[PDB]
């Protein structure tokens, strides 16, 4: 998880916001799976009582 946090201060001071009273925090990651042998996975589909 790549986390990037900018607290209010000179870090967020900008021509659009000279005073810099906004901040944010973000998080991102990569995912994907590879299936080698599909035969070994099993499944049984059914209904369930209330």
């Amino acid at each position: 998880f790549t986390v990037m946090t900018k607290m209010p201060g000179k870090e967020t001071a900008d021509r659009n916001d000279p005073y810099g009273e906004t901040g944010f925090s973000s998080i991102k990651w990569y995912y994907g799976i590879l299936v080698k042998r599909p035969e070994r996975l099993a499944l049984i589909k059914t209904v369930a009582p209330l």
């Binding site: 659009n16 916001d17 000279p18 005073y19 810099g20 009273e21 906004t22």
Partner: protein, 50 residues
């Protein structure tokens, strides 16, 4: 009515500017002289006229 005020969402709000002024002067040249002849200095009764 002309005070500088802000809100929590600060932005392009209050701008100020500065000015400078320049001054000048000049220079001029002076002088005067006098001339004499040798007999005037040699034969005058006053020894020390120079």
């Amino acid at each position: 009515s002309k005070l500088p005020l802000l809100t929590e969402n600060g932005g392009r709000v209050n701008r100020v500017g500065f000015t400078r002024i320049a001054r000048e002067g000049s220079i001029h040249k002076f002088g005067f002289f006098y001339e004499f002849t040798q007999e005037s200095i040699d034969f005058d009764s006053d020894d020390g006229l120079m």
